[PDB]
Design a protein around this nucleic acid. Structure first.
Lengths: 51, 53, 185, 148, 167, 222
RNA sequence: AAUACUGCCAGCUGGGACUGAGGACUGCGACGUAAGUCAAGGAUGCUGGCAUAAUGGUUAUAUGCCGCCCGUCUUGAAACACGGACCAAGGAGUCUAACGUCUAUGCGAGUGUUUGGGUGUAAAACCCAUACGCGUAAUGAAAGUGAACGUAGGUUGGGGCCUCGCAAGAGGUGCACAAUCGACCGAUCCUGAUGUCUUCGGAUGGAUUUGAGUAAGAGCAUAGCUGUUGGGACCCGAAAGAU
RNA sequence: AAUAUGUAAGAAGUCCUUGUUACUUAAUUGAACGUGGACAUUUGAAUGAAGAGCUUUUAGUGGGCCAUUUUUGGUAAGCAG
RNA sequence: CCCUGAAAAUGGAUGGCGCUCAAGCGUGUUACCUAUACUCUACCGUCAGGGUUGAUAUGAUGCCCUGACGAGUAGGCAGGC
């Protein structure tokens, strides 16, 4: 009779997707990335800063 | 193209290897890595207006 | 505002629940609506349409046509079905001993069938005897025989039978019909 | 009748289904079959070709009596025989007993050959026949004896 | 006749309703309302008056008392939207309020035939007021000018912009 | 024939195993998206480290919205909007990318706004304005039962399987897209960010290839 | 390091408005083993006041904004284009003969009682013979001739039915209907046999020819919308003409 | 040149074999239509299909105007085309 | 940008008032106002796809579900007073 929308209404959200539950559990909408400070190249950055 | 398609179907009767016979348009292209060695980028900018008469 | 591609509120142009007040027809169409609804029977669908149909597309069928249909191979001990009237062809001298289902039979046709040894059956008896078209054979009489359709399509170089009342010489056999007077159509 | 007529569905609507721009006047293109050679030429040469002119040799004082010649085919000849004796002749298909048929008293002048009688002899009385019909009869073993 | 009948009649029995899933949770108040807090009534007979708050009831209201020896407000129950809450607060703990509830706040509705053409209080309720407000005044008289505060009333003035006010 | 306990229970059991299959598939898809995007980032950093340049791929998919109303539309643009199923102002559709499709969109440039969308806005669309073509009727999706009943042919069992095929364009994109009714979007709640639409997005207008701000536009329009 | 900017959250929470359709249960799901509960296929619970002109409806006015005089011919009318001062009543696509298309009804290779006759509770209803009209055979200027080589043909496609199969499909029969190639009849143009009152007959076989045809008949009668023609012919309107 | 415009993108198709014929070839050579067999899920590019196709009958209309762009006559025109 | 060039007849119009680091001219950023448009919901009607004969009391042209759509002169049809 009526369309109940996800992005609120967590009940119908779970009704359409259990990965909502496990997603919220492991907190993947705010998931951290392993920081790795690799470097760029001198040729790239001087080509960039080439006025 | 028709007789060549028949040749492809013959090869797939020989091995069963999923021809995908139909033509398809120029699909958008895939990634790649262009290098820079001997190929540094020349910075460009416009040229002023000279009348040239 | 909507950019319509088709037309809006167009009927399908098909005829449902026909115009007559024939109460027996209304009973029959009640029955076959039930059957076509609840029987997944294309035969029932076809006979439903044929019961919806008008008079010019319910042309009369001959015992000769019935005989030809039964004279098909391996198709002789079938049940003939005709959504229309069944006329008597005195142009034949034999008939098998099958059964036939139809709304209407003429006097001569009734006499022909029962003299051969058949039984002239109604479509409700056909339904309660055979709700899924078991061993049936529906026939249809020729639509394109009529005076109307021999006139339909008239014009130059079609060979298509002008809409005159009277006939003979000095009635449309002249200029436009031959070459010594005017031209050939 | 009067209440199923569109004159009742035109009451209020201004021009009675005839129009504002081009009105309903008396006789805009003529009266009768006027202008068949001038301005209804397209109708005359599309839907009634042959309407203008005369063709043949005239016939003064024609009589449909003289031109009475109704026709009949052979299926309908065996229909001309009444059923009640027809079945006896059919089962007793043989010569020296063959039925006579008066086409003239049946109301026909000619006899035509539209096919596939049985192979039983039968006698026919007629004023006129066709070649194929006479052949079909004597191939069934019957005969035509003519009359006037 | 004058009007014949219809071919057909409707049903006279009412169909049951569906099973509504509007279950009852209790109220969730706002952060600014804890007990022992001072408030200002805005609506009613005591509109614009500073009163103490003691107990949320179970039928979504708030229980208050003036106290009655200070301003003239007795015990009552009011509405959380129809009050404002303040930062000012006093201690209340060491009184009993568990006696009071809705059945204590019964009305005993009138018989509808009784018409008021032209023209009382309960010894129980007044002595409840006596014990509660004597305990409450014993708790209040320590801190200064709270008695003056409740005794005085509240209004707005030319400059009193509420969205910048802080009650 | 009681048909109360065994049948209901077996339906619940079948439901449960389907939930488990859907859940593991969604796990695979999350792994696929996260893996892919983090590899793209990482490869970008690798080429930037090497001194090379990482030409990223183009996008196989776009989202198109009809902006212009129905009036005063020449016959080729009109026919093309009808082919892309854009018969009203503020209406959107997914589109696969080809020579042919892109030239088609260049025909209908003055009338549409199209761009390269993301998983977030695709998911938002298909959850809030997402419908299905069951016997030429627009039905709410609202259930993976419905979705698998229509698309069990094509390897689909759920709304997220549908979205997965959409953004990772597959050998069933055609059927998935013709199943998805076009999206009936509202006006942008944030406005259009400009005073005058009908100029190309470049020049201070709205229409044309809004190639990555299409996400912002769609979310404001939904 | 951090912040800005861009994006992501199936992160949390607050404030506001509009709406509450539907009406026993069925379905999807969530929390828990369970008990059941739930925000899960559309709002319920608690309370007050009125219990009446209070709400509402009608009507007049006031106020804010908008609103040109109707009908007509017109590319375009509120028009400085026509008719209309106002009111009542009357007042304009009708009927008829023949017909086309469609639909309904009866009968069906037949159909039509009603010119007429018998009768009668009387211009009604009922019954009836002979014909006659239309249809069942067309073609040709006419003389005239006159529609199965074949399961009334062959090919392609076709609803429906039958067989195998759980189903997909595979096969057989295949009405109507559609395209085509054939055969038959008439007309035209050719050949010209047995024969012959030697000037008659026309067998057989043909042809990029032609027909309003045959190829297991479909029509007749009544009624209705619509359209056509002749009639005053949707209503009103000449200058004229004739006796 | 641009813009406009025709056609093809297969099942009524492709391949293999041999049947017909008064047509054609020096010729079982070729043509046209067929028998029998093989080629499927990508049966031959994209997108969309709101059903696809077919007939009958009939109204009104046959004074047209305006804008972008192209353009003729005219100095030009709310000009004429 | 402004000024001269720049002269028509009832009195007279950036629409008026009026405006001068503007309420003018050029450009940019935001916020804001509002269409019978867009989105959501309800209601009326139409069109389409469907369900429902079983018994009682109902009309099976009935009862119910789903989806889309609603401009209109000449004109056509359909249901009604």
């Amino acid at each position: 009779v009526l369309k109940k929308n996800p992005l609120k209404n967590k009940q119908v959200l779970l009704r359409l997707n259990p990965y909502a539950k496990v997603f919220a559990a492991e907190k993947l909408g705010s998931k951290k990335a392993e920081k790795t400070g690799t470097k760029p190249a001198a040729v790239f950055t001087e080509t960039l800063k080439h006025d | 193209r028709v007789k060549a398609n028949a040749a492809k179907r013959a090869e797939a009767k020989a091995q069963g290897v999923a021809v995908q016979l139909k033509r398809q348009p120029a699909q958008p292209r895939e990634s790649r890595i262009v290098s820079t060695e001997g190929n540094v980028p020349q910075t460009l900018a416009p040229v002023p207006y000279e009348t040239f008469i | 505002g909507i950019d319509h591609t088709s037309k809006q509120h167009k009927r399908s142009g098909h005829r449902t629940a026909p115009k007559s007040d024939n109460v027996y027809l209304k009973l029959l169409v009640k029955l076959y609506t039930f059957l076509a609804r609840r029987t997944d029977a294309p035969f029932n669908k076809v006979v439903l349409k044929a019961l919806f149909l008008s008079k010019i597309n319910r042309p009369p069928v001959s015992v000769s046509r019935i005989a030809r249909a039964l004279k098909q191979e391996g198709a002789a001990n079938k049940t003939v079905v005709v959504v229309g009237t069944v006329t008597d062809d005195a142009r034949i001298f034999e008939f098998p001993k099958t059964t036939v289902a139809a709304l209407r039979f003429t006097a001569g046709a009734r006499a022909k069938i029962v003299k051969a040894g058949g039984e002239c059956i109604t479509l409700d008896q056909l339904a309660v005897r055979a709700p899924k078209g078991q061993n049936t054979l529906i026939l249809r009489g020729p639509r394109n025989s009529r005076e109307a359709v021999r006139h339909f399509g008239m014009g130059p170089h079609k060979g298509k039978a002008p809409r005159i009342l009277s006939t003979g010489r000095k009635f449309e056999r002249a200029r436009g019909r031959r070459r010594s007077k005017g031209f050939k159509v | 009748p009067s209440r199923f007529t569109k004159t009742r569905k035109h009451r209020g609507h201004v021009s009675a289904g005839k129009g504002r721009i081009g009105k309903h006047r008396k006789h805009p293109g003529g009266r009768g079959m006027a202008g068949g050679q001038h301005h209804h030429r397209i109708n005359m040469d599309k839907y009634h070709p042959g309407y203008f002119g005369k063709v043949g040799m005239r016939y003064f004082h024609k009589q449909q009596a003289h031109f009475w010649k109704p026709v009949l085919n052979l299926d309908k000849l065996w229909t001309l025989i009444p059923e009640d004796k027809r079945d006896q002749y059919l089962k007793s298909a043989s010569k020296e007993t063959a039925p006579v048929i008066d086409t003239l008293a049946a109301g026909y002048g000619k006899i035509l050959g539209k096919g596939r009688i049985p192979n039983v002899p039968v006698i026919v009385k007629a004023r006129f026949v066709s070649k194929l019909a006479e052949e079909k009869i004597r191939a069934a073993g019957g005969v035509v004896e003519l009359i006037a | 006749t004058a009007q014949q009948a219809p071919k057909w009649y409707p049903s006279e029995d009412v169909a049951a309703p569906k099973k509504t899933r509007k279950a009852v949770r209790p109220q969730k108040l706002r952060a600014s309302l804890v007990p022992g807090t001072v408030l200002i009534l805005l609506a009613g007979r005591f509109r614009g008056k500073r009163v103490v708050y003691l107990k949320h009831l179970e039928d979504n209201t708030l229980l208050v008392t003036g106290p009655f020896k200070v301003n003239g407000v007795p015990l009552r129950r009011v509405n959380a939207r129809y009050v404002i809450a303040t930062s000012t607060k006093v201690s209340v703990e060491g009184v009993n309020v568990e006696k009071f509830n809705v059945e204590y706040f019964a009305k005993e509705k009138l018989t509808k035939k009784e018409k008021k053409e032209a023209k009382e209080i309960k010894t129980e309720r007044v002595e409840d007021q006596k014990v509660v407000d004597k305990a409450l005044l014993a708790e209040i008289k320590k801190t200064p000018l709270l008695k003056q505060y409740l005794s005085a009333s509240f209004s707005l003035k030319n400059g009193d912009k509420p969205h910048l006010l802080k009650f | 024939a009681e048909q109360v306990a065994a049948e209901r229970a077996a339906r619940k059991a079948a439901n449960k195993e389907k939930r488990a299959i859907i859940l593991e598939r969604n796990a695979a898809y999350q792994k696929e998206y996260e893996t892919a995007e983090r590899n793209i980032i990482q490869a970008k950093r690798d080429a930037k480290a090497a001194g090379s340049y990482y030409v990223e791929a183009q996008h196989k998919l776009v989202f198109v919205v009809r902006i212009k109303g129905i009036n005063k539309i020449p016959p080729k643009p009109r026919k093309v909007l009808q082919l892309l199923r854009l018969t009203r102002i503020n209406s959107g559709t997914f589109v696969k990318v080809t020579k042919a499709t892109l030239e088609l969109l260049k025909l209908i440039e003055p009338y549409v706004a199209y761009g390269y969308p993301s998983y977030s806005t695709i998911r938002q669309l298909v959850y809030k304005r997402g419908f299905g073509k069951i016997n030429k009727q627009r039905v709410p999706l609202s259930d993976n039962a419905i979705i698998e009943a229509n698309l069990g042919k094509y390897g689909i069992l759920s709304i997220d399987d549908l979205i997965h095929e959409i953004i990772t364009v597959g050998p069933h994109f055609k059927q998935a897209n013709n199943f998805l009714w076009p999206f009936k979007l509202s006006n942008p709640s944030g406005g259009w960010g400009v005073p005058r639409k009908f100029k190309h997005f470049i020049q201070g207008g709205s229409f044309g290839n809004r190639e990555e701000f299409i996400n912002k536009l769609v979310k404001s329009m939904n």
